[PDB]
Amino acid sequence: ANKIADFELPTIIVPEQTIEIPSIKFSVPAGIVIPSFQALTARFEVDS
Amino acid sequence: NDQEKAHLDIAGSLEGHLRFLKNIILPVYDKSLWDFLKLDVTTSIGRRQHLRVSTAFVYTKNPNGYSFSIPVKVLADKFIIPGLKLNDLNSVLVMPTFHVPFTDLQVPSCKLDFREIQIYKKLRTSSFALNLPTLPEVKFPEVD
């Protein structure tokens, strides 16, 4: 800059920056579950 | 929907001032609506008419039900799953710790089990960083 216009640049300093890595959880099946039938119920009502 | 039970419930409520409709007579029968039906409440005069419909679907399930679970043996530093013990290949393989070139990452030592399945509960990652002349140098702390 001084080579061109005798004026020098203001100094810029970027300090140390902390960057966060959010936690991640991966689930792999350790077994299967088949729900056992216990009861099935259906109710229909018409009210007039 | 959950592990224990499933609920599907829908209800429809309608309200309408259909009083005038109820105020009708039948010349073919020569009878009134309320009279012919023989109903007065909401029919003789005609009232604010409601229609109510309910549908309830409910099913019961066991959260544990009929479950097939892999056999797992858990230790402080490892898990052991006794899979098929085939003798065709080498029983074990030991992996020494390795220093990755140009960085400080230390690969933790591990023992690989073929007859069983051996997992190590926690794996340790050594810290490492980039070496640059005044550039932003990322320094990585250890993570387990």
Instruction: Assess contact for B121 and B76: CB atoms under 8 A.
Output: yes
Facing residue for A39 by CB, picked from B60, B67, B138: B60
The DSSP code for A36 is P
Residues of chain A in contact with residue B56, where contact means CB-CB under 8 angstroms, are: 41-44
Instruction: Assess contact for B108 and B95: CB atoms under 8 A.
Output: no
Residues of chain B in contact with residue A34, where contact means CB-CB under 8 angstroms, are: 65-67
CB contact under 8 A, A38 and B62: yes
Residue B119 CA to residue B111 CA, distance in Å, equals: 9
Residue B136 CA to residue A13 CA, distance in Å, equals: 11
Residue A46 CA to residue B52 CA, distance in Å, equals: 6
Instruction: Assess contact for B43 and B22: CB atoms under 8 A.
Output: yes
CB contact under 8 A, B136 and A33: no
CB atoms closer than 10 angstroms to residue B61: 20
Residue B54 CA to residue B48 CA, distance in Å, equals: 20
Residue type, B2: D
CB contact under 8 A, B55 and A39: no
DSSP string, A6-23: S--PPP------------
Type and span of the H or E element at A46: strand A39-47
Dihedral class, residue B119 (left if φ above 0, else alpha if ψ from -120 to 50, else beta): beta
The answer for residues whose C-beta is within 8 angstroms of residue A15's C-beta and 6 or more apart is none
Instruction: Assess contact for B69 and B81: CB atoms under 8 A.
Output: no
Phi and psi of B20, rounded to 5°? -60, -40
